């Protein structure tokens, strides 16, 4: 009885549905009755063409603002180079109108879509904070296909106002259930960038989303890191198809590309999921992503099975999003228990790094206390260290269940002598593991140079609960 969209470019939307099973299984969610109705998504970017033939029907001024010019109207600034097309492309991936004879369809083609014009100007901490904190009891899901520069030498994250916006959003947004923040993990693949050097993707409050090519490969632009949660399809080489979406000047494009295309698709899938259960918290949503994402037929050299039997890759997180599985699991979902936080200061003295440093610590994870954690969610290694050439470092963290997370891989372009100042390297790879027992931090010099430095602080921060585990996969 469900009739798939008739839009002219819908047959080119290979990532929404195919018989090949190289897709996000979005039609299966549409057939269950979930198309995004009642859900509000905002695209934080360079503006949104609110009069676009394939966005006007879903456009929501309540989900929109212009922070660059301080006005309500997020219309892009038109230039000859069409520099401000980026947000309009992202928006159509989420919520382009279906069955209207124009272009293709959004993942959540009955959701309401807005945009925050905030990248077309100097993007300060205050600009980010006003954007992330926009109308947080009307907008459900925020999508951000932007971040710190992907030059492979930057270590940067949200400053104080933006970090406050994240915390306010997950605590008080969406009626106390928490704003959903979806982040593109980055385009720094060619620079050998790591998305753990990016505090937006590295945040526990964002769902960081990576990309896979049509043929199931790690795209040239992809950044590997342990903070990535899951993956959606995007562009690859010139024999692989690309993303079909709304373009600036009321046009349709079949060549949207990069990390920028993956976050909006994830935001659309999450919109469908919220429609299936409006009572999901921001942490519920990450649990659903972990449990339902699919590694199958994604190619990587680093797939590993964690302590609860789930396959995880630094290129892909838990794998490809599966919209049908998300909405099915969401319907009878039991809200997770309140989040506990266990802070473990690991060092008793500073340690010289030299060629290699291994720090082992057996922990009880707040045994006997109200923040006792037996079911891990995010884990952070907050490191403070000095070093003469930062990009020569590789850092690994091994959980008691034997799961080895690459917190930091070598970055050939990172020549910095600034080290790390309480940088919160985050891993999702030990999700649902029991964190009691021996943790191992490994810091190594990957170069033949005679480098030198000192690890002066290692705080292991565990988040999670103490109830409700599933039998391991």
């Amino acid at each position: 009885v469900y009739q798939e969209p008739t839009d002219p470019k819908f047959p080119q939307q290979w990532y929404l549905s195919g018989v090949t099973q190289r897709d996000l299984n979005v039609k299966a969610a549409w057939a269950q009755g979930y198309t995004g109705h009642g859900i509000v998504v905002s695209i934080l970017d360079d503006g949104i063409e609110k009069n676009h033939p394939d966005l006007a029907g879903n456009y929501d001024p309540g989900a929109s603002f212009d922070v660059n010019d301080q006005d309500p109207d997020p219309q892009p600034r038109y230039t000859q180079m069409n520099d401000n097309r980026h947000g309009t492309r992202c928006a159509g991936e989420v919520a382009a109108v279906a069955n209207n004879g124009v272009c293709g369809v959004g993942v959540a083609y009955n959701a309401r879509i807005g945009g925050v014009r905030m990248l077309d100007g100097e993007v300060t901490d205050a600009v980010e904070a006003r954007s992330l904190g926009l109308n947080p009891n009307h907008i459900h899901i925020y999508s951000a296909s932007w971040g710190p520069e992907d030059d492979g030498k930057t270590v940067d994250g949200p400053a104080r106002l933006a970090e406050e916006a994240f915390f306010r959003g997950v605590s008080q947004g969406r009626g106390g259930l928490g704003s959903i923040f979806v982040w593109a993990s980055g385009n720094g693949g060619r620079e050998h960038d790591s998305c753990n050097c990016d505090g937006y993707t590295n945040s526990i409050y964002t769902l960081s989303i990576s990309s896979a090519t049509q043929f199931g490969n790690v795209p040239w632009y992809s950044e590997a890191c342990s903070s990535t949660l899951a993956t959606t399809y995007s562009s690859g080489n010139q024999n692989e198809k690309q993303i079909v979406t709304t373009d600036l000047r009321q046009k349709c494009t079949e060549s949207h590309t990069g990390t920028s295309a993956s976050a909006p698709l994830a935001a659309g899938i999450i919109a469908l999921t919220l429609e299936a259960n409006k009572n999901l918290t921001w942490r519920d949503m990450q649990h659903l992503v972990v449990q339902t994402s699919k590694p199958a037929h994604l190619n990587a050299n680093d797939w590993a099975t964690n302590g609860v039997g789930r396959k995880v890759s630094h290129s892909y997180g838990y794998g490809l999003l599966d919209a049908g599985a998300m909405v099915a699991l969401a319907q009878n979902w039991t809200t997770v228990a309140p989040q506990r936080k266990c802070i473990i200061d690991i060092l008793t003295e500073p340690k010289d790094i030299g060629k290699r440093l291994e720090v082992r610590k057996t922990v009880t994870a707040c045994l006997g206390e109200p923040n006792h954690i037996t079911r891990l969610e995010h884990a952070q290694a907050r490191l403070t260290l000095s070093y003469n050439r930062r990009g020569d470092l590789a850092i690994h963290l091994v959980s008691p269940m034997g799961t080895r997370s690459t917190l930091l891989a070598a970055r050939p372009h990172d020549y910095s002598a600034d080290g790390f100042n309480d940088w919160a390297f985050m891993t999702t790879h030990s999700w649902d593991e029991d964190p009691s027992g021996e943790w191992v931090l490994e810091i190594e010099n990957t170069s033949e140079a005679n480098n030198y430095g000192t690890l002066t602080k290692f705080t292991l921060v565990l988040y999670g609960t103490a109830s409700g585990s599933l039998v391991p996969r």
């Binding site: 990248l119 300060t124 932007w146 710190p148 520069e149 920028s260």
Partner: peptide, 5 residues
Amino acid sequence: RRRVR
């Protein structure tokens, strides 16, 4: 740029 697309 501090932040890029």
